[PDB]
Tab-separated table of C-alpha atoms and ligand atoms in Angstrom:
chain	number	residue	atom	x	y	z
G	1	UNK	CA	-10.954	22.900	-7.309
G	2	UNK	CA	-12.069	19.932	-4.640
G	3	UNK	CA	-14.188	17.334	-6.805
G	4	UNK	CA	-16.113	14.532	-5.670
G	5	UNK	CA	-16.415	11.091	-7.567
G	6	UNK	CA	-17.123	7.719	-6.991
G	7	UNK	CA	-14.239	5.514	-6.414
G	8	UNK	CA	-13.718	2.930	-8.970
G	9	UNK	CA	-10.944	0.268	-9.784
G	10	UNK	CA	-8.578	2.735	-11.201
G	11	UNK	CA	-8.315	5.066	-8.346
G	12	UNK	CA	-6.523	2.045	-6.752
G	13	UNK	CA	-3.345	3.188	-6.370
G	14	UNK	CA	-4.617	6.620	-4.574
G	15	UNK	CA	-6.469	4.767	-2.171
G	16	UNK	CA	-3.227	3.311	-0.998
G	17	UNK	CA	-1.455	6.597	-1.151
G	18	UNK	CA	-3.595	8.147	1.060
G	19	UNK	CA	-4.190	5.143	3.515
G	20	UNK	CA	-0.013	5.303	3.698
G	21	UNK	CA	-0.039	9.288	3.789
G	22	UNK	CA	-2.255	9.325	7.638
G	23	UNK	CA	-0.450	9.067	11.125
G	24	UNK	CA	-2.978	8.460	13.138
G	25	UNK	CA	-5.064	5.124	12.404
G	26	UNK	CA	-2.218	3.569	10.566
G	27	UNK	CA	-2.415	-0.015	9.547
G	28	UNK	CA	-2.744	-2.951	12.013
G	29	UNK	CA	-1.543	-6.433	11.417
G	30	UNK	CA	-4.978	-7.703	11.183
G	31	UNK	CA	-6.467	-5.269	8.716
G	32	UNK	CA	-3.060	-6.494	5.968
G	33	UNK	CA	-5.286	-8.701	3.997
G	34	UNK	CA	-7.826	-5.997	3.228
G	35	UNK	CA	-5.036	-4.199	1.068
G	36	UNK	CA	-4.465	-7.111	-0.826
G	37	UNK	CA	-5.318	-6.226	-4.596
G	38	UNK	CA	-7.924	-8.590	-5.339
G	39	UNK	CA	-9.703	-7.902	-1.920
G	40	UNK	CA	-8.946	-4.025	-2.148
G	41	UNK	CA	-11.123	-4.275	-5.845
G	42	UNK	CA	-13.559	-6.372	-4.397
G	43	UNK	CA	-14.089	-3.528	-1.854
G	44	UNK	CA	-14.534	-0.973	-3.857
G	45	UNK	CA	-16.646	-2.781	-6.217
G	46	UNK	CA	-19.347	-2.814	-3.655
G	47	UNK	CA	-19.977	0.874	-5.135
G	48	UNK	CA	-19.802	2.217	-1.984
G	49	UNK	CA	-17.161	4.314	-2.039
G	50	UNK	CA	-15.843	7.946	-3.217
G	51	UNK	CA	-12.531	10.126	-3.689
G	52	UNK	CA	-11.937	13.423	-3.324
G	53	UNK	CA	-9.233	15.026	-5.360
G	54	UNK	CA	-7.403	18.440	-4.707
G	55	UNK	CA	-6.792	19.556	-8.818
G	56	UNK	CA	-5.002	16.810	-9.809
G	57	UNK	CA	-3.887	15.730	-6.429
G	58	UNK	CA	-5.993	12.728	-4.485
G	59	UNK	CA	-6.554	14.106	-1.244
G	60	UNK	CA	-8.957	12.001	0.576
G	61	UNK	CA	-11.301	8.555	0.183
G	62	UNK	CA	-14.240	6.517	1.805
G	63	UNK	CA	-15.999	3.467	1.414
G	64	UNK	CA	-19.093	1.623	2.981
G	65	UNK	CA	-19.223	-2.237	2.577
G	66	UNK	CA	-21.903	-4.496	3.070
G	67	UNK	CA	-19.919	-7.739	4.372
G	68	UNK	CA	-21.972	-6.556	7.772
G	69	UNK	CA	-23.053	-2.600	7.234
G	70	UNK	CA	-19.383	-1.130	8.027
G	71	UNK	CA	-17.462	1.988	7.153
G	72	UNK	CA	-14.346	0.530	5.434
G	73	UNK	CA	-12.036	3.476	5.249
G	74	UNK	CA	-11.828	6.786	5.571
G	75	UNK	CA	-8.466	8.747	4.870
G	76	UNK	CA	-7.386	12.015	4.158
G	77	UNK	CA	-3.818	13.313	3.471
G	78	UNK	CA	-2.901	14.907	6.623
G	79	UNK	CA	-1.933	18.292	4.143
G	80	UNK	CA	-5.967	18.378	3.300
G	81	UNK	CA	-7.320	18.090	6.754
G	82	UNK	CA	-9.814	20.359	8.742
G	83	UNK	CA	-11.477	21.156	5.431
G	84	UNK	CA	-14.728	19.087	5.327
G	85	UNK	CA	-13.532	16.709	3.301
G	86	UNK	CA	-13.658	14.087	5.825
G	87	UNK	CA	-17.201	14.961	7.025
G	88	UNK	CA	-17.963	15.190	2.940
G	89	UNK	CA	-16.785	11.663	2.451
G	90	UNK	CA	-18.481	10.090	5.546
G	91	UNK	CA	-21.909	11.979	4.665
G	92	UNK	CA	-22.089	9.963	1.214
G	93	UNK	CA	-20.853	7.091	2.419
G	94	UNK	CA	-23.509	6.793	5.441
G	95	UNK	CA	-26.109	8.582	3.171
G	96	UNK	CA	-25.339	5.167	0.583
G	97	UNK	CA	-25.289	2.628	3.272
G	98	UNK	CA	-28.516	3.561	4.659
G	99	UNK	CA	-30.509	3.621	0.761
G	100	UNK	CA	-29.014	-0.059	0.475
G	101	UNK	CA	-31.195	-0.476	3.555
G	102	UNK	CA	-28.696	-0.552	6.911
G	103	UNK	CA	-30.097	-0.135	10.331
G	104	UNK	CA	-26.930	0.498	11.848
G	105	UNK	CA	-23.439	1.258	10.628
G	106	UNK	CA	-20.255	-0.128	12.186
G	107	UNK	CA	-17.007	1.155	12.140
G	108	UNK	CA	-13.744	0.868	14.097
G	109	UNK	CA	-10.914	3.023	15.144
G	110	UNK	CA	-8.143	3.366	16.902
G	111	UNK	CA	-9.511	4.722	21.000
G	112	UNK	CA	-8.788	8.039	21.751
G	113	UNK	CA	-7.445	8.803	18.472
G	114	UNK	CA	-8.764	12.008	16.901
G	115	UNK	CA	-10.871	10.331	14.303
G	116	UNK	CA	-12.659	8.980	17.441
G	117	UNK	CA	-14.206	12.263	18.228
G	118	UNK	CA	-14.355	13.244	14.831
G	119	UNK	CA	-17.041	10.266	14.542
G	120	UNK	CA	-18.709	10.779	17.583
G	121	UNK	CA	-19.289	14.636	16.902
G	122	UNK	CA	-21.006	13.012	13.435
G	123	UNK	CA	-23.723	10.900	15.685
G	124	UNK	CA	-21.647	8.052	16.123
G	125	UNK	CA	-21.381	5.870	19.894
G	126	UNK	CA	-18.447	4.208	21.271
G	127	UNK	CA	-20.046	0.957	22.406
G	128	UNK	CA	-17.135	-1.222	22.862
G	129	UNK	CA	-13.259	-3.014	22.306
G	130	UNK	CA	-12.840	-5.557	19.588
G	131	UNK	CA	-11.013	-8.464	20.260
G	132	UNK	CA	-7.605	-6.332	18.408
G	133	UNK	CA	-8.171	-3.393	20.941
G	134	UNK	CA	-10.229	-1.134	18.120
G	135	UNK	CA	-12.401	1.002	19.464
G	136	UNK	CA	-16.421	-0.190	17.911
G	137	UNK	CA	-18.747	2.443	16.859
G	138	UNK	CA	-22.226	2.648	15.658
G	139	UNK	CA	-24.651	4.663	13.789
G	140	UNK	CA	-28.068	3.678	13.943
G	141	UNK	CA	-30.469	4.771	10.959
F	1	UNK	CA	16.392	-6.673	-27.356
F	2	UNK	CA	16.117	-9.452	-24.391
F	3	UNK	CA	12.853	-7.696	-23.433
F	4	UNK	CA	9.624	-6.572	-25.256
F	5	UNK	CA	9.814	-3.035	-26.331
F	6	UNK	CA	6.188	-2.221	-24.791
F	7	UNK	CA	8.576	-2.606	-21.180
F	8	UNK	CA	10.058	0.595	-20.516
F	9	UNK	CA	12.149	1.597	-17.212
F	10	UNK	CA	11.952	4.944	-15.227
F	11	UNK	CA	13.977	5.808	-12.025
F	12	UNK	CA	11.721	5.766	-8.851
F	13	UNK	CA	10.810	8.776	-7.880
F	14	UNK	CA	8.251	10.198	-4.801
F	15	UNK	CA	5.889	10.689	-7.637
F	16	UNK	CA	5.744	6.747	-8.068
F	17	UNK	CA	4.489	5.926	-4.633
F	18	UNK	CA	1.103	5.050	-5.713
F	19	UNK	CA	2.568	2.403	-7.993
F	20	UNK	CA	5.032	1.229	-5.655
F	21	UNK	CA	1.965	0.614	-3.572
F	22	UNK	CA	-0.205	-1.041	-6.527
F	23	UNK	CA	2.288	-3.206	-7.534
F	24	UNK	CA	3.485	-4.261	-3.781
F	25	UNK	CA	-0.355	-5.271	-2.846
F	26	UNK	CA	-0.699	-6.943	-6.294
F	27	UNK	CA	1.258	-10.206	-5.451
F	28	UNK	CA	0.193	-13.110	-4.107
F	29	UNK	CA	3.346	-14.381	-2.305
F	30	UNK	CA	5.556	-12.542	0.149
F	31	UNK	CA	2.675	-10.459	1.121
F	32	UNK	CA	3.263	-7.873	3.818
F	33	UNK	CA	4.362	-9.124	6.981
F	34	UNK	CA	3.492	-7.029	10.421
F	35	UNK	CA	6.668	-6.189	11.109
F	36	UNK	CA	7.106	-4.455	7.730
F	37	UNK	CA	3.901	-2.492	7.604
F	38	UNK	CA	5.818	0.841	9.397
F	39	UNK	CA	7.910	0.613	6.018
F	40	UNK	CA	5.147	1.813	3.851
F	41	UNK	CA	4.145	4.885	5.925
F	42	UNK	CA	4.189	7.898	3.664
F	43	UNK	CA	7.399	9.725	5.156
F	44	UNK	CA	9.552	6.702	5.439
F	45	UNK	CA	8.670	5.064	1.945
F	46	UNK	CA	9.477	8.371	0.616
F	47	UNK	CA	12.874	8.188	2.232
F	48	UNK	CA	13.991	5.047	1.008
F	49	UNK	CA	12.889	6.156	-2.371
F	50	UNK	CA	14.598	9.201	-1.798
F	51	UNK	CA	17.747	6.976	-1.020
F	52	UNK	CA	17.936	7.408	-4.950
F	53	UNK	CA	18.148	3.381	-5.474
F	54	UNK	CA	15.161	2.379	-7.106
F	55	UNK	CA	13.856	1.655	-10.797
F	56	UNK	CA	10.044	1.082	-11.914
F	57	UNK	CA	8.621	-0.464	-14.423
F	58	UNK	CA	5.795	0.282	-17.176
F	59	UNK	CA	4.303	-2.722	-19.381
F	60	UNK	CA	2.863	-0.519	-21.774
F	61	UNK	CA	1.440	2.292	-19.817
F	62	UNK	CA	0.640	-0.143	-17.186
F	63	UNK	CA	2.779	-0.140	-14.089
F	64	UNK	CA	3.933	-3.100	-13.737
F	65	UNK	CA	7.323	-4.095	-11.138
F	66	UNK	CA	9.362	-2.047	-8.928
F	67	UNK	CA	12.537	-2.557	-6.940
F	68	UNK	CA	14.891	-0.487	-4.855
F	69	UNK	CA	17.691	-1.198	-3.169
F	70	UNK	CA	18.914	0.967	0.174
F	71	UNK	CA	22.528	1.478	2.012
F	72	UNK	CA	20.731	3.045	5.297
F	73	UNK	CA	21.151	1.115	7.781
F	74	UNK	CA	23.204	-1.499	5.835
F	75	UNK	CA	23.159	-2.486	2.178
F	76	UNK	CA	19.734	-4.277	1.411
F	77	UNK	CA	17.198	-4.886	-1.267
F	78	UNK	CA	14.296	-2.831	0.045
F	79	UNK	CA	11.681	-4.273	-2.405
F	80	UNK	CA	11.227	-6.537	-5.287
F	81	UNK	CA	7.614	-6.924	-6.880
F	82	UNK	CA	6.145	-7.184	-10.073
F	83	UNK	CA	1.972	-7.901	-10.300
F	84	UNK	CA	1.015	-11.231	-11.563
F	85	UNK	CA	-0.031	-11.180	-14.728
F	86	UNK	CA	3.711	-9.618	-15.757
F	87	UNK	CA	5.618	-12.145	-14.101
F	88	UNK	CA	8.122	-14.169	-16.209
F	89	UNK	CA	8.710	-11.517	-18.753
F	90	UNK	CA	12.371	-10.583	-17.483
F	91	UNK	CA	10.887	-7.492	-15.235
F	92	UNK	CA	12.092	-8.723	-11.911
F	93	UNK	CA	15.328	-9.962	-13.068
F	94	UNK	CA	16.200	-6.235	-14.940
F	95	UNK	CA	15.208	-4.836	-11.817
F	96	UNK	CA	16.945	-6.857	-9.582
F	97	UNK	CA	19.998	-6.617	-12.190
F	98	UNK	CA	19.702	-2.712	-11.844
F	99	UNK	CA	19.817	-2.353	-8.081
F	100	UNK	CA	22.444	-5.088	-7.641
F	101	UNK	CA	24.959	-2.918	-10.022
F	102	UNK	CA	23.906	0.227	-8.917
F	103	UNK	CA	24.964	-1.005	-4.868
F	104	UNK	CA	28.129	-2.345	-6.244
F	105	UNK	CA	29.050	0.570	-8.651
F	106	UNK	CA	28.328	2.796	-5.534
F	107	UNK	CA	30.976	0.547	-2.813
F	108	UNK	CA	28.577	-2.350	-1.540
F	109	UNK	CA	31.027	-5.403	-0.288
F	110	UNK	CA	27.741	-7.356	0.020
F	111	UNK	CA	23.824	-6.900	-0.364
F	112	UNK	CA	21.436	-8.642	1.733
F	113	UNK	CA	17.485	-9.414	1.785
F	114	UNK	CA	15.097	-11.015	3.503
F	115	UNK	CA	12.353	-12.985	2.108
F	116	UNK	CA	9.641	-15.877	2.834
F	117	UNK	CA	11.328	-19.058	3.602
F	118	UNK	CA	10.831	-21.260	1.056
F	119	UNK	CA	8.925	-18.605	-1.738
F	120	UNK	CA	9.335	-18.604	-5.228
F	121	UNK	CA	11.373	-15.555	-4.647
F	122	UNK	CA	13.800	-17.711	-2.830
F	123	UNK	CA	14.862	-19.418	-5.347
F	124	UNK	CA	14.353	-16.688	-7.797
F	125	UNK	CA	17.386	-15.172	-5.561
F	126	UNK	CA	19.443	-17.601	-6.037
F	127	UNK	CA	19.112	-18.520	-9.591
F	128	UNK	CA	21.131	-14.419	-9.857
F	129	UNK	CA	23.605	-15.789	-7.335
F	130	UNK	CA	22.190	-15.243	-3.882
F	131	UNK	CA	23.037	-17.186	-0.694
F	132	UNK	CA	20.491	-18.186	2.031
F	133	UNK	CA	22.583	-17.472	5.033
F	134	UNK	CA	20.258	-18.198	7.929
F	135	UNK	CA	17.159	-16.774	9.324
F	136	UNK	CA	15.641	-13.158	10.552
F	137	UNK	CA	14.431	-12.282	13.796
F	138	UNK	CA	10.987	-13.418	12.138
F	139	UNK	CA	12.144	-16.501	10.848
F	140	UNK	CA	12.530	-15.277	7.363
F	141	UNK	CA	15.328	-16.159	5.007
F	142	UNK	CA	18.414	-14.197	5.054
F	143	UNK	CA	20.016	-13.804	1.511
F	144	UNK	CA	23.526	-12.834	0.866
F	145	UNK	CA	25.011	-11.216	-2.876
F	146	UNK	CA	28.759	-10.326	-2.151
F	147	UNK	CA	30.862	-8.131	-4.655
L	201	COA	C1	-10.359	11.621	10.759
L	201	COA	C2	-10.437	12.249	9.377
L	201	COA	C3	-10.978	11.218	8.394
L	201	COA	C4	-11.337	13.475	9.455
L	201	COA	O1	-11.357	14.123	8.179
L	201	COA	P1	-11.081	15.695	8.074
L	201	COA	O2	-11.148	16.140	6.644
L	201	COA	O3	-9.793	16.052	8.777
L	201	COA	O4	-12.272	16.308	8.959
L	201	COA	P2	-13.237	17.547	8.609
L	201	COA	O5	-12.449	18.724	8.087
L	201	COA	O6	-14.330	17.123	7.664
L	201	COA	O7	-13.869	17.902	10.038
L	201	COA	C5	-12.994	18.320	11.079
L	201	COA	C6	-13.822	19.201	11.993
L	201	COA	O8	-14.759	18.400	12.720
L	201	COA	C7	-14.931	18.952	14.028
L	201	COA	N1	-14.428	17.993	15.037
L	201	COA	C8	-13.448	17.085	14.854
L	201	COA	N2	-13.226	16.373	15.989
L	201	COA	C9	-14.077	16.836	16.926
L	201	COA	C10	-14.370	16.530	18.343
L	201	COA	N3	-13.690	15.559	18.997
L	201	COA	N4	-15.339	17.251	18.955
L	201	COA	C11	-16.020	18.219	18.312
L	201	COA	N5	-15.806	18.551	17.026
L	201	COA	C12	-14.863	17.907	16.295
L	201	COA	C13	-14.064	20.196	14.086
L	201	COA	O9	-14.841	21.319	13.670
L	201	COA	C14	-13.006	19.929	13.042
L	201	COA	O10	-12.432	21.129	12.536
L	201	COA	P3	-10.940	21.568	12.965
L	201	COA	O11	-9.981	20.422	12.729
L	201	COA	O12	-10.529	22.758	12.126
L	201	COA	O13	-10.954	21.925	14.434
L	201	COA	C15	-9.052	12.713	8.915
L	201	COA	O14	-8.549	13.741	9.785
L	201	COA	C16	-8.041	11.599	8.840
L	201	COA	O15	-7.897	10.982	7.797
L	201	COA	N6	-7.319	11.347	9.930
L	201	COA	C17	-6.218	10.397	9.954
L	201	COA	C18	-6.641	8.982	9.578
L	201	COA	C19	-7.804	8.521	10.411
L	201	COA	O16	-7.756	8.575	11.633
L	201	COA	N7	-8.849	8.046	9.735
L	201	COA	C20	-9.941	7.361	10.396
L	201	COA	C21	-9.780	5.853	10.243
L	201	COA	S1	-11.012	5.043	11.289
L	202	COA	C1	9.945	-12.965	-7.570
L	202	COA	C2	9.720	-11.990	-8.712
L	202	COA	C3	10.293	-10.635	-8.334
L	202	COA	C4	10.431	-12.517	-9.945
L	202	COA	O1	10.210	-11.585	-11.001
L	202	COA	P1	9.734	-12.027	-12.468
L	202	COA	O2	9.540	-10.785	-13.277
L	202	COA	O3	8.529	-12.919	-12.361
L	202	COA	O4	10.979	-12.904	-12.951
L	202	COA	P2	11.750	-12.900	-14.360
L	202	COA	O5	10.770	-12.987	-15.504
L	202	COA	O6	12.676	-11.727	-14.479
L	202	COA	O7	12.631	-14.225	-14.237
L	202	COA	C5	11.952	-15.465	-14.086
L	202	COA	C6	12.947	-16.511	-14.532
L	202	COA	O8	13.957	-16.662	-13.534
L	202	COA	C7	14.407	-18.016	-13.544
L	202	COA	N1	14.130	-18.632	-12.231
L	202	COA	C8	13.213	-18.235	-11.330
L	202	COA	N2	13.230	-19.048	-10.239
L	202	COA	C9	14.175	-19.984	-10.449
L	202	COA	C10	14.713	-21.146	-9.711
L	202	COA	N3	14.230	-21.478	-8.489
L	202	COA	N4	15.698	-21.864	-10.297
L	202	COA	C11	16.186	-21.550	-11.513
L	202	COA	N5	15.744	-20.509	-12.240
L	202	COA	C12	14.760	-19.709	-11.767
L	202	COA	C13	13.571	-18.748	-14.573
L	202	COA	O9	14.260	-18.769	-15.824
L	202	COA	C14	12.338	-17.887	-14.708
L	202	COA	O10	11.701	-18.041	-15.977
L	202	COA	P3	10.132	-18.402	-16.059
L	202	COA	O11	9.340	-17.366	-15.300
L	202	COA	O12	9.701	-18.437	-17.509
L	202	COA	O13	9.890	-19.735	-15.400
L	202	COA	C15	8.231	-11.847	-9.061
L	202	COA	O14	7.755	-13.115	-9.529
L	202	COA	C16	7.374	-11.398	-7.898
L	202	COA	O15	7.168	-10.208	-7.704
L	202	COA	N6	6.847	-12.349	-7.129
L	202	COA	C17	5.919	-12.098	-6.029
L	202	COA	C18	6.432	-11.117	-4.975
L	202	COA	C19	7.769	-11.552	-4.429
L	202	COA	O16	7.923	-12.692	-4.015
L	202	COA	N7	8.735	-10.633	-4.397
L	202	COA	C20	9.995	-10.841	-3.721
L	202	COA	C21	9.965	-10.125	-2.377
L	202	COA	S1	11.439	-10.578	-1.435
């Protein structure tokens, strides 16, 4: 069955696999150095973050940082979408970044992309363009 | 006998993409450039896997280097990478000595890669007999093997 657990250093490699497994949102040249291993740990060793796995297949993950209150990813294999596990994911991770004490949440994404409305149906607001073109959205508490 | 038995070899299969990944974000030199980003989408790593010219490496049951060499579009070294703290235990050079022999075994006249100008890896090239024939479109170095 679908599980839900905290993401931890060892579920590195499936974080990757399902960053690479999405085509929509796919990597931009300025978000490379996140992915690098020491920076990818030091992500998810803010504790922010959880994985969902299908059985014994990863199917999706997210992570809050505090940086900056900011959604750092959220991915799931395009095979095990439209089946809440996105909206699972997102509801811990916001639920977690507002105990540690956020006012708002930030996140980007690509505009117009589906994940944009997927946010914006959760409460979030499109309330800008980053300087890479991102679309910037925010949850307040 | 060259190598610590605790170092085992496995073809690359599509079930090792989450190690190829690991072990490609480990490094600390030729990290990923822009242009090569489109590379590591899910479909088209899983094609050049699938290309059937890759080997993997375990340091215990640690993953710890991969390489793979393609012959779509031309005869290259598609990746070479082995994390850190297993460097300069003979892990790149098997797997660069596997790839190389299975291109040539398979009709390669010559293999070429690309790589950061000037990189350990550079000179790691050439030490197995690779020639730095110019420069990419990106201003990376252009290495040459022939048969
Ligand atoms: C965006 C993403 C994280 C959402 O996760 P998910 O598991 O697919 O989403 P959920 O199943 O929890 O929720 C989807 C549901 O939300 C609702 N919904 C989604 N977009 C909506 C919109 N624009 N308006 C109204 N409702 C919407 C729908 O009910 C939808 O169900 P449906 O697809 O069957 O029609 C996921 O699809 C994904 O990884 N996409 C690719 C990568 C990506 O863009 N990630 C975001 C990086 S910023
Ligand atoms: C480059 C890389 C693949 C080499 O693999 P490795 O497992 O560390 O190398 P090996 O142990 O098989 O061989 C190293 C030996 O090659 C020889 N060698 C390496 N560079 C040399 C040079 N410039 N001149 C002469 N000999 C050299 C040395 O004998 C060296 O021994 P040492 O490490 O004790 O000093 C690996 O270090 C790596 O992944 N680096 C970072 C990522 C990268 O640059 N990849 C290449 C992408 S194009």
């Amino acid at each position: 069955l679908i599980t839900f657990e905290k993401l931890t250093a060892q579920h590195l490699p499936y974080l990757y696999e399902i960053r690479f497994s999405v085509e929509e949102n796919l990597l931009h040249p300025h978000q490379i150095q996140y992915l690098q291993r020491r920076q990818a740990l030091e992500d998810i060793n803010q504790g922010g973050g959880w994985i969902c796995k299908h059985g014994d297949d990863y199917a999706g993950v997210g992570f809050g940082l505090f940086i900056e209150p900011l959604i750092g990813g959220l991915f799931v294999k395009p095979e095990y979408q439209s089946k809440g596990i996105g909206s699972a994911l997102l509801a811990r991770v916001t639920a977690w970044m507002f105990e540690r004490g956020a006012e708002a949440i930030h996140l980007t994404t690509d505009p117009g992309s589906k994940a944009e409305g997927f946010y914006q149906h959760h409460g979030w607001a499109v309330v800008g363009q980053d300087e890479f073109g991102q679309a910037e959205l925010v949850k307040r508490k």
